[PDB]
């Protein structure tokens, strides 16, 4: 009967609200003053990467912290060198409209995808010596928002039609599909242990996903508007997301609620890209006010600016060792900072 | 010892070859013009897409087409494969020279939401520079609809009764004064949204088109000439 299910839903939501109320008994700024600050973070453009014609939507580093790929709206997917500023490859894409790019942790594969609804996979290490497309992943209806490689034969692809999906490249077909979102899931980051991945949507619901089970473990809603970028605080037990609410915040998986939010009165535009530094002290946030920003991830007060672009910052990717950070933007220029 | 130097050399010739390719594709990329076609599903956007396709073909996701007017490459993007929401994938269209907006003028209620879509396009932060070209399809259909009678535009638009035509090209389409009064009321209803805001960066360029039309490609040609003249003057900084 419908009213019994409605009162069960009432009991469930009262249980969730009471768990949030009784669980919340502390604040990170309030319980410990013994935190030491980060102070000024002056980041200078060590080297400027100038090949792209149109705006840049995604970049992704390699595991070696030297190579990095960036895809742009002219239809080029350039693999860069963060030392010599040299273009190892520049793959011309089928579709110009490419909102995402991912580079394999092994290093042999790189992926594109976007509004054309295909998540194409490009193999680099070949005996012929020319970059080719491995296979075309066609199981999505809405635009592809973000993709992340699991290994050489698994990739997870978030889309605009509520569907983030696990795949299998050499089959040519889906393996799993995660459908719990309401609309427009935008950015997804993989857990360090690779067993999990979280994904934020336009509902302002950032939903955890279990790869092995296939369903949503926990759902996080603490934002007032649609979500543009998400990450992992590299412990894997916490993660912070930045949305078009013009604020950003950090949720903990075990605490399963809002924990600490980073905002200011002056900032009146939403994060486009966010990422975490290696030790997780320096939250690093792109923005729509044409410059990046740098946030202390605990004390909740900004600590650095990377104003070197005169367009919105769409890309921000730290290295695996911490030896850089590279922010792309819509002026077709990629800048590595230190 | 020496293989580092050899790798530096080979990497250098690789970078030089890649940049030669990129300076070819810069000319290829700037030689063509991008046009985000957008509009309602009953609005005959696909009809004019077929017309300039005859005068390459879309496969999935985006139903692209290319057409040339006086050896100028026009390549325009009908975004049809995606979902009903459109707030996020339209941010990907600032390199576009001009949005093309197609409207079924005849179906009123299917015209107010066209007005709201224009108001959302105009005030979008990443489309503030982007200038709408506005088409008003189904001209003969609206002519019959307000000529035959019993479908009162005054019901769906209350200010049409007091509205009078200011100055217009009446005599050659002059089948009746009511059809011209109605159609100029509709374009003024779009243009009031157009000229309400803007720092001179973008402007609406309204046109009238029926079902069977061929010269609308040249209309986009002349429009895009005027938009690019305006932004070149803006880079020339004279105000």
């Amino acid at each position, epitope marked *: 009967e419908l009213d019994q299910l409605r009162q069960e839903a009432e009991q469930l939501k009262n249980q969730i609200r009471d768990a949030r109320k009784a669980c919340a008994d502390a604040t990170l700024s309030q319980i410990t003053n013994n935190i030491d600050p980060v102070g000024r973070i002056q980041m200078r453009t060590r080297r400027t990467l100038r090949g792209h014609l149109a705006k840049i939507y995604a970049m992704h580093w390699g595991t070696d912290s030297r190579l990095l790929v960036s895809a742009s709206q002219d239809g080029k997917l350039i693999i860069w060198d963060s030392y010599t500023t040299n273009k190892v490859h520049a793959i011309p894409l089928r579709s110009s409209w490419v909102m995402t790019c991912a580079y394999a942790p092994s290093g042999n594969y790189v992926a594109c995808g976007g509004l054309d609804n295909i998540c194409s996979i490009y193999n680099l290490k070949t005996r012929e010596g020319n970059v080719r497309v491995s296979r075309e992943l066609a199981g999505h209806t809405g635009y592809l928002s973000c993709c992340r490689f699991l290994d050489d034969n698994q990739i997870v692809t978030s889309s605009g039609d509520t569907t983030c999906a696990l795949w299998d490249i050499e089959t040519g077909q889906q393996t799993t599909t995660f459908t719990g979102h309401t609309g427009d899931v935008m950015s997804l980051s993989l857990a360090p242990d690779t067993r999990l991945f979280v994904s934020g949507a336009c509902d302002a619901s950032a939903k955890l996903w279990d790869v092995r089970e296939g369903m949503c473990r926990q759902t996080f809603t603490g934002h*007032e508007s649609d979500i543009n970028a998400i990450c992992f605080f590299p412990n894997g037990n916490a993660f912070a997301t930045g949305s078009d609410d013009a604020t950003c915040r950090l949720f903990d998986l075990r605490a399963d609620q809002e924990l600490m939010t980073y905002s200011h009165d002056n900032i009146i535009c939403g994060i486009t890209s966010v990422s975490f530094s290696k030790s997780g002290r320096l939250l690093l946030a792109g923005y729509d006010d044409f410059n990046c920003n740098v946030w202390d991830a605990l004390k909740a007060d900004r600590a650095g600016v990377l104003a070197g672009h005169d367009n919105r910052v769409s890309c921000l990717g730290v290295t695996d060792d911490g030896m850089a950070v590279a922010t792309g933007s819509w002026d077709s220029f990629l800048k590595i900072w230190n | 010892t020496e293989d580092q130097r050899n790798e530096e050399k080979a990497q250098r010739e690789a970078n030089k070859k890649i940049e030669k390719q990129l300076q070819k594709d810069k000319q290829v990329y700037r030689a063509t013009h991008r046009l985000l076609l957008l509009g309602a599903d009953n609005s005959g956007k696909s009809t004019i897409v077929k017309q300039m396709r005859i005068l390459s073909g879309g496969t999935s996701g985006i139903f692209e087409t290319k057409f040339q007017v006086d050896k100028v490459n026009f390549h325009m993007f009908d975004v049809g494969g995606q979902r009903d929401e459109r707030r996020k994938w339209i941010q990907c269209f600032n390199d576009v020279t001009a949005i093309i907006f197609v409207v079924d003028s005849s179906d009123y209620n299917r015209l107010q939401e066209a007005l709201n879509l224009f108001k959302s396009i105009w005030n979008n*932060r990443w489309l503030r520079t982007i200038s709408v070209i506005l088409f008003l399809n189904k001209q003969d259909l609206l002519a019959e609809k307000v000529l035959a009678g019993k479908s009162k535009i005054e019901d769906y638009f209350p200010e049409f009764a007091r509205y009078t035509t200011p100055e217009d090209a009446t005599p050659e389409p002059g089948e009746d004064p009511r059809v011209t009064r109605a159609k100029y009321f509709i374009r003024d209803e779009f243009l009031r949204i157009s000229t309400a805001s803007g720092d001179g960066r973008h402007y609406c360029y309204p046109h009238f088109t029926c079902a069977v039309d061929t010269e609308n490609a040249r209309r986009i040609f002349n429009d895009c000439r005027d938009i690019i003249q305006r932004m070149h003057l803006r880079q020339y900084e004279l105000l």
Partner: nanobody
Framework: QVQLQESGGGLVQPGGSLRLSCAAS????????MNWVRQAPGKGLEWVSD????????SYTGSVKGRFTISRDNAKNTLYLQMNSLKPEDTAVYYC?????????????????????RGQGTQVTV
């Protein structure tokens, strides 16, 4: 958490009057350009009226321009719409639709999907 609580409805006779209420929570309410959307059964979902940030700029659908009056209390955290001279065709389900974004005038609140920032639903029939 996004919350849009709606109340006020029931059947009314033609030429009557009624009030719409849209209780909101979880966000800065004096910030967003809300709307009013309705779906008469058998038809699509259509926008009615819009209120900008301070409240000054108001626009109306060209059917309900003269009759309905829209207003809001940003302190009391509620949108309102006052009905006068109700036609027999104004039977519909009424949702207050909040924008995707703050600090801006563009707003895409018409969509047929499960738009996230639109109310669950209050029922008004005639």
């Amino acid at each position: 958490q996004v919350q849009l609580q709606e109340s006020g409805g029931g059947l009314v006779q033609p030429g009557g009057s009624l009030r719409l209420s849209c209780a909101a929570s979880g966000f800065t309410f004096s910030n967003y350009k809300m709307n009013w959307v309705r779906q008469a059964p058998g038809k699509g979902l259509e926008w009615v009226s819009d209120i900008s940030q301070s409240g000054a700029s108001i626009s109306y659908t060209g059917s309900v321009k003269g009759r309905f009056t829209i207003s809001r209390d940003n302190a009391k955290n509620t949108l309102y719409l006052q009905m006068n001279s109700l036609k027999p065709e104004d039977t519909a389900v009424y949702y207050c639709a909040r924008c995707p974004a703050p600090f801006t005038r563009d707003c895409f609140d018409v969509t047929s999907t499960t738009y996230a920032y639109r109310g669950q639903g209050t029922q008004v029939t005639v």
